Structure 1
């Protein structure tokens, strides 16, 4: 009954050389790691080493063109880096960015391999840059390669092609890249909760709405839970898990669970505007542990209040370690009930548990 942890200080080297106060800070990962030490959680975990993803691994989800362009940034000069970053939606690049994105992915591959071989029951990956906005052919929203998507395909590559992987994306933003990568796939169930605001919230696309249920063989295997007009918090997230995430997940019966665990829905986040508490994230983690015989990998995505993300992700690791859930502190915001009912109607054709 062992929990893996991967963290490598080298991933701090990715930085914004024009705006050193950009919220996707190097110290996002060192702060989370530190909170694990001062809570004495780190000594309770088995440390899993980081490694570089290979280019062949990147090709599991990304085009050769995209891989070559990001790879080339390693040797670019500052003006050329600024030029190239400005060509994407919300990207900054330094000479170390490519290596850091490689390490983030390879860290998650090693963790998934530890889980699937039974060396650990579950694991946490304290990694940056994030992944879930990255598409097959382009970088986006602070993400270069789609770490969680790659890990799902890597896992299938060391087990069997049709291994059922559930990705739960509780980052406050829609994982546009993850949805698109698996949109026609019934082996990877993608469930995202996200602030939507009728398309006004980043990444600013109606792809995130509840009626995008998947395509082709994938119809039913893409579940968008979009929030509108409300400062959502633990009550809304508990209700979404009770009515939607957990029944669908149980029916799908995943063999591996990946959490795209952004902590920007947290109370205090400067961007998310939501109020999920650390005990909220602990309860969400604890519920997912009832799936896949406990085979859960928690992957850091976004989250920009250094205190909030450090407390929030430490509480997730505490639940993976088997600690009992802390106690939560209200009626759902009326628009949250609407959102949940919209998803319920959109997916009950495909999931009899709804």
Structure 2
């Protein structure tokens, strides 16, 4: 089996010109890449090139107005970019932001194509800016275009429209954009684990609660696993995978798995407040590799401790390459609020997934 890897240093050009210490740093991707080389993982992978997404590809998920506005930012002066970014929730923009967002998406299209033709078995995409908060018609939370959602639609476009795509979103934040894009879709199963705190954690919406199961033909195809009242870690994530993610995923029987792989639930993150370990992420990756005949694409989302994200994402690639999972620590009993969350999701989704009964 061959593992693909995409990284292009041009995606570093998107930057915050007023606050050079803003956490969504250019060096997030160069640090992950460096750790892959330092652990000798890079040379074991097959390099996949980045490319620009086209505007037609962006239109698979985004409105023409939103595409045009972000495109127009390429020609603006700093004062105007500061004002434009401030129109969104948690966005900074530089003159390279649009192109970097296009490269992030195109990188993932090339990776999905390589997976779907068998050029590689699985792949990792070391990309920024992230995607999962981006909506059809707007940017949000450091995200301009929804890379994972676009990759699902691109995959369908080169195979068949009903190709079953599973998106597992383990970034500590709810992927509101991904949920909304696919909310009425039964061809793309969206499963998110996220810190929720009864709607008080970013992005601050009850859309992230366990009772949002999808709409229309998509009822049952949106699975929110929301965490409340606890510093969750490996025990809680392993339990969620055993009781919810894996049984639902196996019943769905995806033909492609995309991971919205934020590393902001990691131990050490300055924002997530959680303690998932690098070995925990390795175990989650290894479990997902049992789906879709191994056709897994891991897409970087958030994650802001450079050391944490570099170790964590490298351990995921080690798993894609076929290495044996590192040993987890002794798993403490689940925090009681985590058991409540799991039970709530189980009861909300048992009507749709007989494997949960």
Report if TM-score (shorter chain) is over 0.5: yes
Match of 1:149 in 2: 149
| In 2: Cα distance, 1:20 partner to 1:177 partner | 27
User: Secondary structure at the residue paired with 1:298?
Assistant: strand
How far off is 1:197 after superposition?
0.1
How far off is 1:158 after superposition?
0.1
User: Secondary structure at the residue paired with 1:322?
Assistant: coil
Give RMSD over aligned pairs.
0.2
User: Secondary structure at the residue paired with 2:347?
Assistant: helix
CA deviation profile, 1:98-155 (whole Å, cap 9, x unmatched) = 0000000000000000000000000000000000000000000000000000000000
How far off is 1:351 after superposition?
0.1
How far off is 1:92 after superposition?
0.1
User: Secondary structure at the residue paired with 1:192?
Assistant: strand
CA deviation profile, 1:218-271 (whole Å, cap 9, x unmatched) = 000000000000000000000000000000000000000000000000000000
How far off is 1:64 after superposition?
0.1
How far off is 1:201 after superposition?
0.2
> Structure 1 stretches of 5 or more lacking a match?
none
User: Secondary structure at the residue paired with 1:167?
Assistant: strand
CA deviation profile, 1:143-184 (whole Å, cap 9, x unmatched) = 000000000000000000000000000000000000000000
| In 1: Cα distance, 2:250 partner to 2:55 partner | 34
Match of 1:334 in 2: 336
| In 2: Cα distance, 1:106 partner to 1:201 partner | 31
Normalization by structure 1: what TM-score?
1.00
Runs of 4+ residues deviating >4 angstroms = none
| In 2: Cα distance, 1:325 partner to 1:154 partner | 31
How far off is 1:81 after superposition?
0.3
CA deviation profile, 1:17-37 (whole Å, cap 9, x unmatched) = 110000000000000000000
How far off is 1:87 after superposition?
0.1
How far off is 1:52 after superposition?
0.2
The size of the alignment, in residue pairs, is: 354
How far off is 1:215 after superposition?
0.1
User: Secondary structure at the residue paired with 1:140?
Assistant: coil
How far off is 1:274 after superposition?
0.1
How far off is 1:2 after superposition?
0.1
| In 2: Cα distance, 1:103 partner to 1:179 partner | 23
Normalization by structure 2: what TM-score?
0.99
> Structure 2 stretches of 5 or more lacking a match?
none
| In 2: Cα distance, 1:140 partner to 1:134 partner | 5
User: Secondary structure at the residue paired with 1:353?
Assistant: helix
| In 1: Cα distance, 2:146 partner to 2:115 partner | 20
> Within 5 Å, which residues of 2 pair with 1:247-326?
247-326=247-326
User: Secondary structure at the residue paired with 1:163?
Assistant: coil
User: Secondary structure at the residue paired with 2:354?
Assistant: coil
How far off is 1:334 after superposition?
0.2
> Within 5 Å, which residues of 2 pair with 1:129-278?
129-278=129-278
CA deviation profile, 1:248-298 (whole Å, cap 9, x unmatched) = 000000000000000000000000000000000000000000000000000
| In 2: Cα distance, 1:208 partner to 1:174 partner | 6
User: Secondary structure at the residue paired with 1:272?
Assistant: coil
User: Secondary structure at the residue paired with 1:226?
Assistant: strand
| In 2: Cα distance, 1:266 partner to 1:99 partner | 29
How far off is 1:349 after superposition?
0.1
| In 2: Cα distance, 1:158 partner to 1:240 partner | 32
User: Secondary structure at the residue paired with 2:355?
Assistant: coil
| In 2: Cα distance, 1:249 partner to 1:117 partner | 22
User: Secondary structure at the residue paired with 1:120?
Assistant: coil
| In 2: Cα distance, 1:78 partner to 1:120 partner | 42
